[PDB]
Design an enzyme around this catalytic site. Structure first.
Site, short mmCIF file in Angstrom:
data_model
loop_
_atom_site.label_atom_id
_atom_site.label_comp_id
_atom_site.label_asym_id
_atom_site.label_seq_id
_atom_site.Cartn_x
_atom_site.Cartn_y
_atom_site.Cartn_z
CG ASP A 60 -0.23 0.24 2.52
OD1 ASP A 60 1.00 0.46 2.59
OD2 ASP A 60 -0.97 0.26 3.54
CG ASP A 82 1.31 3.29 4.72
OD1 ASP A 82 0.16 2.92 4.96
OD2 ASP A 82 2.27 2.57 4.42
CG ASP A 126 -3.81 2.68 4.92
OD1 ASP A 126 -4.85 2.30 4.39
OD2 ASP A 126 -3.10 1.86 5.53
N1 LIG Z 1 -4.22 0.63 11.38
C1 LIG Z 1 -2.87 0.79 11.40
C2 LIG Z 1 -2.11 0.30 10.34
C3 LIG Z 1 -0.73 0.46 10.37
N2 LIG Z 1 -0.12 1.08 11.41
C4 LIG Z 1 1.34 1.26 11.40
O1 LIG Z 1 1.66 1.96 10.20
C5 LIG Z 1 2.90 1.53 9.67
C6 LIG Z 1 2.65 1.19 8.20
O2 LIG Z 1 1.86 0.01 8.09
P1 LIG Z 1 1.95 -0.94 6.80
O3 LIG Z 1 1.64 -0.15 5.53
O4 LIG Z 1 1.22 -2.21 7.11
O5 LIG Z 1 3.52 -1.26 6.85
P2 LIG Z 1 4.68 -0.96 5.77
O6 LIG Z 1 5.95 -1.01 6.58
O7 LIG Z 1 4.34 0.30 5.01
O8 LIG Z 1 4.68 -2.30 4.87
P3 LIG Z 1 4.33 -2.49 3.31
O9 LIG Z 1 5.61 -2.23 2.57
O10 LIG Z 1 3.91 -3.94 3.29
O11 LIG Z 1 3.18 -1.55 3.02
C7 LIG Z 1 3.39 0.43 10.60
O12 LIG Z 1 4.35 0.98 11.53
C8 LIG Z 1 2.17 -0.02 11.38
O13 LIG Z 1 2.49 -0.49 12.69
C9 LIG Z 1 -0.91 1.59 12.48
O14 LIG Z 1 -0.39 2.17 13.46
N3 LIG Z 1 -2.26 1.42 12.44
MN LIG Z 2 2.61 0.56 3.85
MN LIG Z 3 -0.99 1.03 5.53
#
Ligand SMILES: Nc1ccn([C@@H]2O[C@H](COP(=O)(O)OP(=O)(O)OP(=O)(O)O)[C@@H](O)[C@H]2O)c(=O)n1
Ligand SMILES: [Mn+2]
Ligand SMILES: [Mn+2]
Length: 330
Positions: free
Chosen positions: A194, A196, A254
């Site tokens: 995703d 962020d 997000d």
């Molecule tokens: N509802 C959520 C979702 C995520 N997070 C935090 O937001 C960060 C990003 O989450 P995620 O996108 O799942 O992790 P990425 O490291 O960006 O992994 P990816 O490369 O798979 O997107 C993380 O520290 C996670 O703990 C959070 O606090 N609350």
């Molecule tokens: Mn992410």
């Molecule tokens: Mn995310």
């Protein structure tokens, strides 16, 4: 020699032990699928030790004097070094339970408890889920609709295009409002599941009602496939329709809004990695007696909140050397 907590040591993006860490991470993931939270954390910690090593582990003697590297994780690495394969890992990979839990939990809006429930009820495939739409939330329906695209790694080129449309919408809705890329891409990752973004404005309260205006703008450009707005920080968990040359791709995004007073905490929390943040919070509680979360840093004995202008402030207050985001890849 290497410190105990992941937040006391740099963990870079690329490392010398990918085969080994990946095998340990399979065992951690499988443990989480079975509700075995302790064992999940133990395997995660061991994998993150290997990521912080400066050289490949070629022989078992290299394990000597490492924290969080118990008998089980040692055994796994031993068989990989001697035999090129670990039996326990291969059996997990081949198991229907693991394959199905991975299939389901990957879907947008599906966690472990939902995936396990479906498994127990005899569901196995994505078609099985589509045959039971009464069992699905609207978010999960959307996740199924776009599953192929959402299984395709998100690329830096995708992030750059998305940040441009989000920045344009934010800037048109409220001049002065800012958009910050967070998550793995902030840590230097080349791909992700995703994108962020953290949104704020330098005057506290000017961020009120900004997100729905941003979403209206994005919706009117044809860029939104799915949106769920939640009034914790205001956030929209979305699926964007990203145009590409000759086609398009659904991409999870997000969008999180934080008031500027809380921005440093939110940026730290959302930048990750998930393990890094778990470790940072455990460190804060156990070593410093403070409770850290995405909104602040609380002293439960004094009943006070720490005022931070930056991530650097928070590290300093906790007595930790600062780690830039690209060294938080625990
Ligand atoms: N509802 C959520 C979702 C995520 N997070 C935090 O937001 C960060 C990003 O989450 P995620 O996108 O799942 O992790 P990425 O490291 O960006 O992994 P990816 O490369 O798979 O997107 C993380 O520290 C996670 O703990 C959070 O606090 N609350
Ligand atoms: Mn992410
Ligand atoms: Mn995310």
């Amino acid at each position: 020699w290497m410190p105990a907590y992941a937040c006391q040591r740099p963990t870079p993006l690329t490392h010398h032990n990918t085969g080994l860490s990946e095998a340990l991470e399979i065992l951690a993931e499988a443990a989480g699928f079975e509700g075995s939270e302790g064992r999940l954390l133990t395997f995660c910690r061991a994998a993150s030790v290997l990521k912080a090593l400066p050289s490949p582990v070629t022989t078992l003697s290299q394990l000597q004097g490492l924290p969080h590297f118990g008998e089980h994780s040692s055994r796994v690495v031993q068989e990989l070094l001697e035999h090129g394969v670990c039996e326990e890992v291969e059996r997990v990979r081949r198991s229907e339970r693991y394959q199905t839990m991975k299939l389901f939990t990957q879907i947008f809006g599906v966690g472990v408890k939902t995936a396990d429930r479906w498994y127990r009820e005899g569901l196995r495939t994505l078609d099985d889920l589509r045959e039971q739409p009464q069992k699905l939330t609207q978010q999960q329906k959307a996740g199924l609709q776009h599953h192929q695209d959402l299984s395709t790694p998100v690329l830096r080129s995708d992030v750059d295009a998305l940040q441009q449309v989000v920045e344009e919408a934010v800037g048109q809705a409220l001049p002065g409002a800012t958009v910050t890329l967070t998550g793995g891409f902030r840590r230097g990752k080349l791909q992700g599941h995703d994108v962020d973004f953290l949104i704020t404005h330098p005057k506290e309260g000017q961020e009120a009602g900004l997100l729905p205006r941003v979403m209206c703008r994005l919706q009117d450009q044809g860029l939104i496939l799915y949106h769920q707005h939640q009034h914790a920080f205001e956030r929209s968990f979305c699926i964007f329709r990203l145009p590409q040359p000759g086609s398009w791709k659904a991409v999870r995004v997000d969008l999180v809004v934080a008031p500027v007073s809380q921005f440093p905490f939110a940026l730290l929390g959302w930048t990750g990695s998930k393990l890094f943040q778990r470790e940072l919070r455990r460190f804060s509680r156990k070593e410093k007696g403070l409770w850290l979360n995405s909104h602040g840093l609380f002293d439960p004995e004094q009943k006070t909140f720490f005022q931070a202008a930056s991530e650097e402030d928070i590290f300093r207050h906790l007595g930790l050397e600062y780690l830039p985001p690209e060294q938080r890849n625990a």
